[PDB]
Amino acid sequence: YIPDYKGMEPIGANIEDLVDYSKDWLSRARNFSFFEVKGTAVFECFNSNEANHCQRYPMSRKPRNFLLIQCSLITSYKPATTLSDQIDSRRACSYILNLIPDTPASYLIHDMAYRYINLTREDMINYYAPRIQFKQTQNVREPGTFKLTSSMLRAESKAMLDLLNNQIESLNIASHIVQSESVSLITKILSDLELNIVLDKFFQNETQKYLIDVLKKTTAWHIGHLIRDITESLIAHSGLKRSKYWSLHSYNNGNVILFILPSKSLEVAGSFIRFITVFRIGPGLVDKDNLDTILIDGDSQWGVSKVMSIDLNRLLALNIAFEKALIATATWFQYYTEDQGQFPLQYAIRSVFANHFLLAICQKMKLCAIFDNLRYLIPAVTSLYSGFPSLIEKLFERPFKSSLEVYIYYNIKSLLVALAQNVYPSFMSRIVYKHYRSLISEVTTCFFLFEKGLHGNMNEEAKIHLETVEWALKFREKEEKYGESLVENGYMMWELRANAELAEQQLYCQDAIELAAIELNKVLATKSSVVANSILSKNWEEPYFSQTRNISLKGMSGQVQEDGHLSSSVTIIEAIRYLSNSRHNPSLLKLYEETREQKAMARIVRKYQRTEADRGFFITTLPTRCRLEIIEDYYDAIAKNISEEYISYGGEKKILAIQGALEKALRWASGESFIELSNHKFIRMKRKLMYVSADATKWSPGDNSAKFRRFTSMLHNGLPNNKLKNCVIDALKQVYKTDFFMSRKLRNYIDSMESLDPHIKQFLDFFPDGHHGEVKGNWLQGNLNKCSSLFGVAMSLLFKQVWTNLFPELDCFFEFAHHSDDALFIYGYLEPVDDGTDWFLFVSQQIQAGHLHWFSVNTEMWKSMFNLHEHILLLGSIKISPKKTTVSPTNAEFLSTFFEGCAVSIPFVKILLGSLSDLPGLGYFDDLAAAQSRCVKALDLGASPQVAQLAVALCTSKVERLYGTAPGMVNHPAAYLQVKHTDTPIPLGGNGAMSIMELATAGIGMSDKNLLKRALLGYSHKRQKSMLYILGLFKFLMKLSDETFQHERLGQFSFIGKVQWKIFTPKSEFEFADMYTSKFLELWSSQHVTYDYIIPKGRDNLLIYLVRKLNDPSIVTAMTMQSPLQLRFRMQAKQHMKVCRLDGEWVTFREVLAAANSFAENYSATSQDMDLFQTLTSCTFSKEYAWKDFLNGIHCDVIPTKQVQRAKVARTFTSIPAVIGYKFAVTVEEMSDVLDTAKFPDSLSVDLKTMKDGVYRELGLDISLPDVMKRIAPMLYKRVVIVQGNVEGTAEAICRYWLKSMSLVKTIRV
RNA sequence: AGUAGUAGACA
Ligand SMILES: [Mg+2]
């Protein structure tokens, strides 16, 4: 009933006071926060920092290791097999036993080789044996492992084993010999890595000859395949049962030997696989200084590497290193083609590929940090004004331990000085780009070559708490200095006029807040009805827990335990706990009323990102989520009506909106300006633009949340009262003070440290009880993004109003874009046309008339614009970053996107590289669909069709080897099915090879429908046995879909159906999953069919619906699987385990294949199946085949005219659950719940009448039948492309554009 | 010995 809360009275702020304050503030010279970019300045910065660096860190004489694996190749590489491994291992051990060991590592490999060569015939039989026929032996306990006890170890090998189970220096970058040595070493490595050892046709001319056929002969290519084999062996050894034993593998005809030492299993957290590599000395990933030993022979040298301990993250990174480098070099290839208008030469391509492969091999945190610095440094020295001195000072705040670090520093220094001298010379080549986009993209690809979360876990666990503790302490000092009331309620403007120090972060001006709210109300009042309806269109009377966001599997804080930590749970568990302990299902406002007295609590956990410092995100408790949901719903509803706020936009509508803003800015500058003159005359003026790509320093931490309260009390909503407004203000008051708990991991770490250094003592003092402290003002990051972004928009509008009042004679222009801590400001200013006469005189006349603030607009008035905008933003506790903010007349950066004028450049390599890590863990069909979907998303984001096709091939191959369905593997369909690999349905291991264009247009499930059409046509034409077999396979798939339940249906949708996979089974079975028996759950699902499409709105039925949710196969899998645990997928999927679902039991994929074959061979085509398949072929091809028909029928001819590049532009591709619920509703509670869910309960029947007819026409099926509509319903619930300028928004034109871009350098006419 | 680190770790 929206309980009445205390409101806040206005204070009557006057815009005249702020205008006169700005008049005074602009009469003095103001120091610009940025520095001009010149070659001499950057050179001086580098020189000073380089000379000062030697005092920061102790002298180091030995460069540290940078290569994770050391190996070498002299000949072409062949993939390893079992027999090949056996013969290679025998030959390699024969070679090794003839060498002389001197280091303990050489002694250890000698002992391992002796033990392996002294293994019997039976041991060699059990060794290499598949899991089907493996039998335990005295020496061999696992298929690929042997035992090597201490009775068979020398003194040196045992010494090495003891070594394994036992301030930071830096090199001299200032030294000119250290740089030379590092450059020589890295250059030698790179040079030896380059040593040579319809769309399909276009791919053949271009992507094969100049990209694939060039890099296929390189040493890097074959070394990458060898690294894949070695990492596959190490992954196989990392199993929970195999890891405690020794292992010996050989590659390249016995030239490379991998010795795997006993290791902690990689299924555990914080474990390392330990291994040694012994190889023949030659070209490749060789670092002689960091090699453990070199054993000489009769003109043969054998490099023995150190013992390397590698974690799961780096091992999985190394496993896909070849594909990573390949996609990176292909992206570089396309970008070079776009920039230079020509294909790169062979030497440059080989160099780029070797550089990418070296970067992917060296998965080290320090190189990642260096590249993270570089991706910000490059925009700094390429701008007009930037914080490049601070960025260069930050680049030197690190020790350079490895040779690669010194080499990269050398290259970075050279590139930055050359850039600031000015044409964009490349960082990893010797080409001169014409566009800054080519350069920034290339270095961003280099940055994305590093996997996320390479940081040290223990250090980062503290580094994520440090900032929150520090800024809470700062807030405490501010409260002590100025008083609690002044800090919380803000300072008045008359106080700022007396104390100019008041303008700083965590302090705000009440007058500024009110004036900004007035400026926003000037827009909000012209759409009062729209704003009010949007507010009322929220979940204000809907029950709280009947929302998907309220029962999700995302993290949640529980209650303070006996030890004092905050519990870890998920949202659904807390929802079920509250519902069990409650009597009804409360509303959002009711839930806030019940839990208002409890206090906001939070924890911080790692985000696991690839930045130099890992930011952490906060997990709060339930009442905190209620308060935040109230505030964020209110402010999202209000902010949807503001065009300068960009979080409220869609996922990719932001790019379109910022494009429109840029067109407005460029249209304003197209023209001229006129300044009236004393004697009714006019001084002409030229319009100019200046973009500020701005970041915000400590956007949430250095903030005061109370500033929102008054803002909320003054923002215009069309509601007829203040009840909801007062509730939002109350909720904001209830998040002002929060409990911040430290993680138990950091707590135990500090508890294990005995004595404490002073900084750790200062950090620990923030927590009085030792577990949680109190944070004021700071709204936790990602909790009030919409509110704070709208507040920043309001402050920008306040600056606009103040500046307009300041200079009514000046017709300046302003465009503002806010996305929280990201901002894009566009200042349109005026310059004298001819010389400066009649303008300097005019400004002097204005000064002589008392308008002293005109001193700021004498020259470069955009500087004064930014100064005043920054000051007014600081009035609202918003600091523009002095380092991360760039100022430029041409180039802008916003939302990870680069603009040059109005052009758009989105980095598509990020999602392309993430496709290689795409693993939903739900099945072969689902994972293939996800990978292809991400490749299609890359195509929409600017990837070329050829590069997208290459990534599609790589991702499909990766998924095929992941699930064992590729030819020669155990789950290959051809071994058990009487059909071909390409004629098999995809859910049954069918071939995933499919062109990118059809996936982009037709869809993801096109392959199964095409196979169904082929089988139907064959059977209806000549009645083959093979076509009847394929139809029987489709029938078998349809049976499996019927065996499942409607409420258990996730992932991609296939009408034919697919196998159901359960992959991860928890050992604890979760909480609240046993209060209702399985029989009860299935009977309830049988007798309550309305709830397979809607959520129950009553507590009694919603508790059952939620307890049933904890037993979904896709829920227990997703509630226990982590991002890298795809490691386990190499054992229980490829080698195969009890994963798939068949006949109400969990079996292997092999059992599913056998059952499919048996059902398909004994299959007869009936009339019902005939009609069903006919409808499927005649209804899904009425639109999808038209895409295939459009692509096949069209013809492309290559015009001899050379391709012309152009600026890119973003174009567009131009409730039902309640309906099924109403259809299936029988009981009174089901009807009530579907009426509540439905927005228009009265029209529902008519809607149902429209649903039956619409499906009967478009889908050719009647929803009156239960099974048909049950199959149809998942599909009934159903894009922005970066193209060239001439392409229109019609969906028939974007496919045409893709066909035109089928060739990278040639023009195509259709 | 590795990863990591001017927060003491894996161990
Ligand atoms: Mg920015």
3-class secondary structure for A682-713? EEEEEEEEEEEEEEECCCCCCCCCCHHHHHHH
Q: Taking the CA of residue A390 as centre, how many other CA atoms within 13 Å lie in the half-sphere pointing to its CB?
A: 13
Among candidate residues A427, A438, A289, the one with its CA nearest the CA of residue A359? A427
Is the distance between the Cβ of A532 and the closest atom of strand B smaller than 7 Å? no
- 3-class SS of residue A543: strand
- A 451-510 residues, CB < 7 A, strand B: 454-456, 458-459, 462-463, 465-466
Token match 């009262």: residue?
A721
Is the distance between the Cβ of A1107 and the closest atom of strand B smaller than 7 Å? no
Is the distance between the Cβ of A270 and the closest atom of strand B smaller than 7 Å? yes
Q: Taking the CA of residue A205 as centre, how many other CA atoms within 13 Å lie in the half-sphere pointing to its CB?
A: 11
Encoded amino acid at A381, one letter: V
What is the DSSP code (8-state) at residue A784?
A: S
Nearest-nucleotide field for A160 (CA, C1'): B1
CB A1272 within 8 A of CB A1259: yes
Among candidate residues A69, A612, A65, A611, the one with its CA nearest the CA of residue A318? A69
Nearest-nucleotide field for A163 (CA, C1'): B1
Q: Rounded to 10 degrees, what is the CA torsion of A635, A641, A644, A645?
A: 30
Q: Using CA atoms, how far apart are residues A738 and A507, in angstroms rounded to an integer?
A: 18
Q: Using CA atoms, how far apart are residues A355 and A197, in angstroms rounded to an integer?
A: 18
Q: State the distance from the centre of ligand 1 to the C-alpha of A711, rounded, in angstroms.
A: 25
Is the distance between the Cβ of A163 and the closest atom of strand B smaller than 7 Å? yes
Nearest-nucleotide field for A170 (CA, C1'): B6
Is the distance between the Cβ of A757 and the closest atom of strand B smaller than 7 Å? yes
Among candidate residues A23, A13, A21, A12, the one with its CA nearest the CA of residue A808? A23
Is the distance between the Cβ of A753 and the closest atom of strand B smaller than 7 Å? yes
CB A391 within 8 A of CB A373: yes
Nearest-nucleotide field for A307 (CA, C1'): B1
Cα A263 to Cα A136, A236, A244, A309, A317: the distances in Å are 20, 12, 6, 9, 19
Q: State the distance from the centre of ligand 1 to the C-alpha of A429, rounded, in angstroms.
A: 28
B7 C1' – A77 CA distance, angstroms? Answer: 45
Q: Using CA atoms, how far apart are residues A935 and A929, in angstroms rounded to an integer?
A: 10
Q: Rounded to 10 degrees, what is the CA torsion of A638, A643, A648, A652?
A: 160
Is the distance between the Cβ of A307 and the closest atom of strand B smaller than 7 Å? yes
Token match 């000037």: residue?
A522
Is the distance between the Cβ of A1257 and the closest atom of strand B smaller than 7 Å? no
Q: State the distance from the centre of ligand 1 to the C-alpha of A897, rounded, in angstroms.
A: 9
CB A884 within 8 A of CB A684: no
Residue A455 tokens, joined? 């940081």
Nearest-nucleotide field for A311 (CA, C1'): B3
Residue A99 tokens, joined? 């060498």
Phi, psi for A691 (deg, rounded to 5): -100, 130
Q: Rounded to 10 degrees, what is the CA torsion of A975, A978, A979, A980?
A: 30
CB A1298 within 8 A of CB A945: yes
User: If 0-12 CB within 10 Å is exposed, 13-18 middle and 19+ buried, where does residue A527 land?
Assistant: middle
- A 1165-1204 residues, CB < 7 A, strand B: none
Nearest-nucleotide field for A399 (CA, C1'): B6
SS (H, E, C) A81-145: CHHHHHHHHHHHHHHHCCCCCCCHHHHHHHHHHHHHHCCCHHHHHHCCCCCCCCCCCCCCCCCCC
CB A229 within 8 A of CB A321: no
User: Which residue gives the smallest C-alpha to C1' distance to B9?
Assistant: A458
Q: Using CA atoms, how far apart are residues A784 and A636, in angstroms rounded to an integer?
A: 10
CB A1032 within 8 A of CB A1166: no
Q: Is the dihedral of CA A189, A193, A196, A202 positive or negative?
A: negative
Burial A473-487 (b: 16+ CB within 10 A, else e): bbbbebbeebeeebb
Q: Using CA atoms, how far apart are residues A195 and A206, in angstroms rounded to an integer?
A: 22
User: If 0-12 CB within 10 Å is exposed, 13-18 middle and 19+ buried, where does residue A1167 land?
Assistant: exposed
Q: Using CA atoms, how far apart are residues A42 and A46, in angstroms rounded to an integer?
A: 6
Residue A139 tokens, joined? 């020496």
Residue A759 tokens, joined? 């900084």
Residue A55 tokens, joined? 């005092």
Q: Is the dihedral of CA A861, A864, A866, A872 positive or negative?
A: negative
B7 C1' – A165 CA distance, angstroms? Answer: 23
- A 338-377 residues, CB < 7 A, strand B: 363-366
- A 378-437 residues, CB < 7 A, strand B: 398, 401
Is the distance between the Cβ of A26 and the closest atom of strand B smaller than 7 Å? no
B10 C1' – A238 CA distance, angstroms? Answer: 16
Q: Using CA atoms, how far apart are residues A51 and A38, in angstroms rounded to an integer?
A: 20
Residue A1211 tokens, joined? 């174009």
Q: Using CA atoms, how far apart are residues A207 and A1303, in angstroms rounded to an integer?
A: 9
Residue A469 tokens, joined? 């503790």
Is the distance between the Cβ of A264 and the closest atom of strand B smaller than 7 Å? yes
Q: Is the dihedral of CA A832, A836, A841, A844 positive or negative?
A: positive
Residues 6+ apart with CB under 8 A from A928: A956, A959, A986, A992
DSSP for A399-460 reads ---BHHHHHHHHHHHHHHHHHHH--EE-SSSS-EESSHHHHHHHHHHHHHTSPS--S-HHHH
Token match 């708990």: residue?
A741
Is the distance between the Cβ of A68 and the closest atom of strand B smaller than 7 Å? yes
Q: State the distance from the centre of ligand 1 to the C-alpha of A829, rounded, in angstroms.
A: 22
Which H/E stretch holds residue A233? helix A219-237
B2 C1' – A908 CA distance, angstroms? Answer: 35
Q: State the distance from the centre of ligand 1 to the C-alpha of A693, rounded, in angstroms.
A: 5
Is the distance between the Cβ of A32 and the closest atom of strand B smaller than 7 Å? no
B6 C1' – A1034 CA distance, angstroms? Answer: 63
| Helices A176-193, A346-361: inter-axial angle, 10-degree rounding | 110
Q: Using CA atoms, how far apart are residues A285 and A269, in angstroms rounded to an integer?
A: 29
Is the distance between the Cβ of A271 and the closest atom of strand B smaller than 7 Å? yes
Query: Which residues is A692 bridged to in the sheet?
Result: A825, A887
CB A883 within 8 A of CB A394: yes
User: If 0-12 CB within 10 Å is exposed, 13-18 middle and 19+ buried, where does residue A233 land?
Assistant: buried
Nearest-nucleotide field for A167 (CA, C1'): B6
Q: Using CA atoms, how far apart are residues A738 and A1097, in angstroms rounded to an integer?
A: 32
Q: State the distance from the centre of ligand 1 to the C-alpha of A821, rounded, in angstroms.
A: 7
Among candidate residues A242, A293, A284, A283, the one with its CA nearest the CA of residue A108? A293
Which H/E stretch holds residue A395? helix A388-395
Which H/E stretch holds residue A828? strand A822-832
Experimentally, the structure was elucidated by: cryo-EM
CB A39 within 8 A of CB A188: no
Q: Using CA atoms, how far apart are residues A335 and A342, in angstroms rounded to an integer?
A: 10
CB A763 within 8 A of CB A462: yes
B5 C1' – A361 CA distance, angstroms? Answer: 21
Is the distance between the Cβ of A553 and the closest atom of strand B smaller than 7 Å? no
Q: State the distance from the centre of ligand 1 to the C-alpha of A938, rounded, in angstroms.
A: 23
Cα A107 to Cα A159, A296, A817, A1184, A1248: the distances in Å are 10, 15, 65, 65, 79
Residues 6+ apart with CB under 8 A from A1065: A1116, A1120
Rg (CA), chain A: 33
Residue A4 tokens, joined? 């009445």
SS (H, E, C) A844-876: HHHHHCCCHHHHHHCCCHHHHHHHHHHHHHHHC
Query: Which bases on strand B have an atom closer than 7 Å to a protein beta carbon?
Result: 1-11
Q: State the distance from the centre of ligand 1 to the C-alpha of A405, rounded, in angstroms.
A: 27
CB A527 within 8 A of CB A1077: no
Residue A534 tokens, joined? 């949007």
Give me the residue spans of the domains in chain A: 82-166+181-337, 673-694+788-896, 963-1063+1121-1185, 1194-1212+1280-1309, 1216-1276
Cα A578 to Cα A99, A573, A620, A640, A836: the distances in Å are 70, 9, 16, 32, 73
Encoded amino acid at A428, one letter: M
Q: Using CA atoms, how far apart are residues A227 and A1084, in angstroms rounded to an integer?
A: 53
Nearest-nucleotide field for A292 (CA, C1'): B1
Is the distance between the Cβ of A760 and the closest atom of strand B smaller than 7 Å? yes
DSSP for A1243-1268 reads THHHHHHHHHHHHHHHT---TTSHHH
CATH of A673-694+788-896, one of 3.30.310, 1.10.287, 3.40.50, 3.30.70: 3.30.70
Residues 6+ apart with CB under 8 A from A769: A564
Encoded amino acid at A643, one letter: S
Q: State the distance from the centre of ligand 1 to the C-alpha of A376, rounded, in angstroms.
A: 10
Among candidate residues A981, A979, A988, A966, the one with its CA nearest the CA of residue A1030? A979
Q: State the distance from the centre of ligand 1 to the C-alpha of A697, rounded, in angstroms.
A: 11
Residue A822, annotated as binding a ligand = yes
Phi, psi for A942 (deg, rounded to 5): 125, -5
Q: Using CA atoms, how far apart are residues A1157 and A1146, in angstroms rounded to an integer?
A: 18
User: Which residue gives the smallest C-alpha to C1' distance to B7?
Assistant: A459
